Structure 1
Amino acid sequence: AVQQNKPTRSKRGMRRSHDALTAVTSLSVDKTSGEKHLRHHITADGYYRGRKVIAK
């Protein structure tokens, strides 16, 4: 099956009306090192919930 008529830029745009990405609403600050990080994720330096879980 194929289109009998070419779809318009209007129709193209209206289908991508739901393709918009969503930003992370907020980032959690570690209570010890103060780095911002994803919630429930370790920081970039290995801290999580104040404690340093990963040495490197």
Structure 2
Amino acid sequence: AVQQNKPTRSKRGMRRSHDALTAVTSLSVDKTSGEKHLRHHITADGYYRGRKVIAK
């Protein structure tokens, strides 16, 4: 239910060895606006594969 001895800084960091995050390595880039964004997502301005999907 509770510990008999105080775990160490080492075990703490060892348990956090898998808590690191990952960063998206690449971002989509439209050939219409040239703006980059996540893949399979829409850009801020709204362009998407040269069709001008939602703008407002």
| Structure 1 moving runs of 4+ over 2 Å | none
Provide the aligned C-alpha RMSD in A: 0.8
Give, in whole Å, the separation in 1 of the partners of 2:10 and 2:19: 15
Alignment: residue pair count:
56
In structure 2, list runs of 5 or more residues that go unmatched: none
Measured against aligned partners, the alpha-carbon deviations of 1:5-55 in whole angstroms (never above 9, x if no partner) come to: 010000000011001000001001111001101001111111111221112
Give, in whole Å, the separation in 1 of the partners of 2:19 and 2:50: 37
**Is residue 2:23 matched to residue 1:23?**
yes
In structure 1, list runs of 5 or more residues that go unmatched: none
Question: How does the TM-score come out when normalised to structure 1?
Answer: 0.92
SS for the counterpart of 1:55 is: coil
Identical columns (%): 100
Question: How does the TM-score come out when normalised to structure 2?
Answer: 0.92
